Design an enzyme around this catalytic site. Structure first.
Site, PDB file in Angstrom:
ATOM      1  N   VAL B  10      54.304-124.757  50.364  1.00 12.85           N
ATOM      2  CA  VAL B  10      54.017-124.535  51.564  1.00 12.85           C
ATOM      3  C   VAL B  10      52.796-125.584  51.799  1.00 12.85           C
ATOM      4  O   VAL B  10      52.251-125.377  52.756  1.00 12.85           O
ATOM      5  CB  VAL B  10      53.775-122.959  51.740  1.00 12.85           C
ATOM      6  CG1 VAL B  10      55.175-122.004  51.594  1.00 12.85           C
ATOM      7  CG2 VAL B  10      52.722-122.355  51.019  1.00 12.85           C
ATOM      8  N   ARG B  14      44.901-132.929  48.720  1.00 16.33           N
ATOM      9  CA  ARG B  14      43.818-133.578  47.492  1.00 16.33           C
ATOM     10  C   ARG B  14      43.413-132.172  46.778  1.00 16.33           C
ATOM     11  O   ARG B  14      43.159-132.389  45.734  1.00 16.33           O
ATOM     12  CB  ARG B  14      42.619-133.910  48.177  1.00 16.33           C
ATOM     13  N   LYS B  31      48.527-121.100  44.106  1.00 17.86           N
ATOM     14  CA  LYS B  31      47.758-122.559  43.874  1.00 17.86           C
ATOM     15  C   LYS B  31      47.588-123.132  42.718  1.00 17.86           C
ATOM     16  O   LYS B  31      47.139-122.497  41.750  1.00 17.86           O
ATOM     17  CB  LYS B  31      46.511-122.244  44.711  1.00 17.86           C
ATOM     18  CG  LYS B  31      45.838-123.617  44.687  1.00 17.86           C
ATOM     19  CD  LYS B  31      44.453-123.367  45.685  1.00 17.86           C
ATOM     20  CE  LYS B  31      43.627-124.749  45.681  1.00 17.86           C
ATOM     21  NZ  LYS B  31      42.557-124.504  46.523  1.00 17.86           N
ATOM     22  N   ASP B 129      32.644-123.372  53.283  1.00 22.06           N
ATOM     23  CA  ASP B 129      33.834-124.196  53.826  1.00 22.06           C
ATOM     24  C   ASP B 129      34.603-123.282  54.821  1.00 22.06           C
ATOM     25  O   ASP B 129      35.749-123.390  54.671  1.00 22.06           O
ATOM     26  CB  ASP B 129      34.599-124.704  52.705  1.00 22.06           C
ATOM     27  CG  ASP B 129      35.675-125.906  53.208  1.00 22.06           C
ATOM     28  OD1 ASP B 129      35.277-126.613  54.033  1.00 22.06           O
ATOM     29  OD2 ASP B 129      36.550-126.084  52.450  1.00 22.06           O
TER      30      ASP B 129
HETATM   31  C1  LU8 Z   1      43.526-121.780  52.283  1.00 23.76           C
HETATM   32  O1  LU8 Z   1      43.596-121.160  50.660  1.00 23.76           O
HETATM   33  C2  LU8 Z   1      44.674-120.640  50.282  1.00 23.76           C
HETATM   34  C3  LU8 Z   1      45.686-120.129  50.952  1.00 23.76           C
HETATM   35  C4  LU8 Z   1      46.945-119.535  50.499  1.00 23.76           C
HETATM   36  C5  LU8 Z   1      48.095-119.115  51.381  1.00 23.76           C
HETATM   37  C6  LU8 Z   1      48.489-117.792  51.411  1.00 23.76           C
HETATM   38  N1  LU8 Z   1      49.294-117.385  51.904  1.00 23.76           N
HETATM   39  C7  LU8 Z   1      49.822-118.321  53.119  1.00 23.76           C
HETATM   40  C8  LU8 Z   1      49.669-119.513  52.834  1.00 23.76           C
HETATM   41  C9  LU8 Z   1      50.705-120.372  53.840  1.00 23.76           C
HETATM   42  C10 LU8 Z   1      51.791-120.133  53.933  1.00 23.76           C
HETATM   43  C11 LU8 Z   1      52.589-120.854  54.880  1.00 23.76           C
HETATM   44  C12 LU8 Z   1      52.072-121.869  55.408  1.00 23.76           C
HETATM   45  C13 LU8 Z   1      52.876-122.576  56.475  1.00 23.76           C
HETATM   46  C14 LU8 Z   1      52.363-122.793  57.805  1.00 23.76           C
HETATM   47  C15 LU8 Z   1      53.051-123.853  58.703  1.00 23.76           C
HETATM   48  N2  LU8 Z   1      53.523-125.011  58.275  1.00 23.76           N
HETATM   49  C16 LU8 Z   1      52.617-126.157  57.867  1.00 23.76           C
HETATM   50  C17 LU8 Z   1      54.330-124.680  56.880  1.00 23.76           C
HETATM   51  C18 LU8 Z   1      53.360-124.009  55.932  1.00 23.76           C
HETATM   52  C19 LU8 Z   1      50.643-121.959  55.497  1.00 23.76           C
HETATM   53  C20 LU8 Z   1      49.951-121.368  54.554  1.00 23.76           C
HETATM   54  C21 LU8 Z   1      48.738-120.187  52.059  1.00 23.76           C
HETATM   55  C22 LU8 Z   1      48.417-121.613  52.308  1.00 23.76           C
HETATM   56  C23 LU8 Z   1      47.062-119.454  49.302  1.00 23.76           C
HETATM   57  C24 LU8 Z   1      45.877-119.644  48.396  1.00 23.76           C
HETATM   58  O2  LU8 Z   1      45.552-119.719  46.998  1.00 23.76           O
HETATM   59  C25 LU8 Z   1      46.909-119.015  46.283  1.00 23.76           C
HETATM   60  C26 LU8 Z   1      44.721-120.530  48.816  1.00 23.76           C
HETATM   61  O3  LU8 Z   1      43.567-120.969  48.227  1.00 23.76           O
HETATM   62  C27 LU8 Z   1      42.548-119.734  47.790  1.00 23.76           C
END
Ligand code: LU8
Ligand code: LU8
Ligand code: LU8
Ligand code: LU8
Lengths: 283, 292
Positions: B10, B14, B31, B129
């Site tokens: 998803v 970097r 992650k 951040d």
């Molecule tokens: C920010 O930081 C962290 C975030 C997450 C996290 C948790 N739930 C859902 C997400 C997600 C799912 C799906 C999309 C879509 C959005 C639309 N399109 C662009 C495709 C993609 C975006 C975001 C994420 C990224 C996990 C993390 O760690 C395990 C994070 O790090 C601490």
């Protein structure tokens, strides 16, 4: 892809204030799982921070596999997963085994090898590392007759140590705490005690000493800081070298080496690299 | 039941990569950190050790792992999964009404006040951040704050400040003036809280632009979209924020709507060049609780 994280915990092989160590199974393979007590969480953090800085890989360092933090309802669970050495610790092994010349030298040169690897800075590499809790319980015996050093929970890179193995400058609080070489010299002191514990179990002319811990004859079990300071600092006692060692060239050479790990003046003590060289010239 | 199945990527950048995975029949976020960001992994792990960090408006932790064989190391963080994605993603796709706009910004204020306030336990925590990509949208209309890799911790009870060892810096577009001109007082915990307040103001502006009033709404834009190059450098941001004293513009249509008029006032009180003049996270939460 499937990320297989299940470890089967099969038998507890250690329990203490630190927590527990278990023999476990991952994907058919033995691993060792150290489960930290709340009391000793900072040891997990320090080992984890060190391995996140430098992935140590050496035949005489207990092999890292994983650091795991798992969220629980009311607490955090902290596991360190390593290689599993079924023969157990050097402390355990020396109780019920005597040694010949080749096995004794192989044990102590493998420890010196692990220790020199910790101590040396490599450019490109690794920071220099001092252990700060070297003792026979923190050394494991491998099937090939070499040992490996365990437990980097107090390690320093460039909880207090086990009191029985503290160097005089730790007990009298003169240690130069801003100087990294100070911590190497504390490890060398403790190395010398381990050398004594192993040498006692080496047979010569049909004679061997019983396993005893360092200073068994002058301090109680669970000696206090004061008990140790009076022996090591005030009276300047050192472990006994039995007369029978002076009939054996190997034990004669080992007695000289352990003397040169035990100088009151930390800067007079041998380096781990000089100990290795001396051990390669014995026999 | 510790096993995880990685099902789809998803996000990659970097930072490493984020996966949607399956763990005992539930979606989880996994992650995998870049080796360049190994200090963020360790810091986030130190932060999530705190049981009283858990909060409706902070991304929920499941596990953290460091794995290695030979010279290869992997660094894992496993969290709850929010399939609506980040606030940055969400704001591209939808406009807001008054109720939704206030629910989103109050939830972020509630998370930030929870971070900033010491519990006598949980230390006081400054994020460093905060941005719309670091805020996740939940199916209940609230948000949660993510990414504690740059966090600073403080305890007034023991007089301890823990700034960590991480050479990473905040996202350039959201950096406060004292970060961009490098005059920030690094041994002062309150300095880091004030940096979070600046960034919160920018996130308020991003959200408020998407709230409809009188049939008008702005397009989604990131802070300072109009005044800096694409992919702005540290010096690009220092120019507009510190040299030019730029702040995000308030669209004049906001002044016809009581809600947006109150939000404009609140985001201006996050943007003083004097960090000590800025509102606290608790005052922002209280103000948003009263605004309708
Ligand atoms: C920010 O930081 C962290 C975030 C997450 C996290 C948790 N739930 C859902 C997400 C997600 C799912 C799906 C999309 C879509 C959005 C639309 N399109 C662009 C495709 C993609 C975006 C975001 C994420 C990224 C996990 C993390 O760690 C395990 C994070 O790090 C601490
Ligand atoms: C998270 O937790 C644990 C994970 C594991 C484990 C199990 N299977 C596979 C793996 C694996 C290793 C490495 C990659 C690489 C492949 C190459 N690519 C370019 C980068 C990534 C992927 C997967 C791991 C690390 C074991 C554990 O315990 C023994 C874990 O728990 C501590
Ligand atoms: C010092 O420290 C650490 C040590 C270890 C470790 C690694 N291999 C094997 C062992 C072990 C196995 C078996 C016995 C005994 C049990 C009874 N009977 C069968 C005789 C033998 C003892 C000991 C251990 C304790 C792991 C650690 O962490 C995961 C340690 O901490 C860093
Ligand atoms: C943590 O520990 C263990 C992990 C594993 C394991 C499981 N899946 C994948 C991997 C792997 C594959 C490929 C890369 C590299 C290869 C080269 N380049 C492309 C960079 C990426 C790294 C890692 C590993 C090492 C196995 C183990 O034992 C057999 C482990 O030991 C218990």
């Amino acid at each position: 892809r499937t990320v297989a994280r299940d470890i089967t915990l099969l038998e507890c092989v250690g329990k203490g204030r630190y927590g527990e160590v278990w023999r476990g199974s991952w994907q058919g393979e033995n691993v060792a799982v150290k489960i930290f007590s709340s009391r000793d969480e900072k040891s997990w953090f320090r080992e984890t921070e060190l391995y996140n800085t430098v992935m140590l890989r050496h035949e005489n360092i207990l092999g890292f596999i994983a650091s795991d933090m798992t969220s629980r309802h009311s607490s955090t669970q902290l596991w360190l997963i390593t290689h599993y050495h079924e023969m157990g610790s050097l402390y355990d092994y020396l109780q019920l085994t005597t040694l010949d010349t080749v096995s004794c030298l192989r044990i102590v040169l493998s420890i010196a090898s692990g220790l020199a690897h910790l101590h040396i800075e490599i450019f490109g590499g690794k920071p220099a590392i001092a252990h700060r809790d070297l003792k026979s319980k923190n050394i494991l015996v491998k099937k090939n007759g070499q040992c490996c050093i365990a437990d980097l929970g107090l390690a320093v890179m460039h909880r207090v140590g086990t009191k029985r193995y503290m160097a005089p400058e730790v007990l009298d609080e003169t240690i130069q705490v801003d100087c990294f070489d100070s911590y190497k010299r504390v490890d060398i002191w403790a190395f010398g005690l381990v050398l004594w514990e192993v040498a006692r179990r080496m047979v010569s002319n049909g004679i061997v000493e019983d396993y005893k811990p360092p200073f068994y004859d002058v301090v109680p079990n669970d000696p206090s800081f004061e008990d140790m300071r009076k022996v090591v600092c005030v009276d300047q006692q050192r472990p006994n070298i039995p007369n029978r060692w002076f009939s054996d060239p190997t034990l004669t050479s080992l007695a000289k080496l352990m003397k040169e790990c035990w100088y009151q003046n930390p800067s007079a003590r041998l380096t781990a690299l000089r100990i290795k060289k001396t051990l390669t010239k014995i026999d």
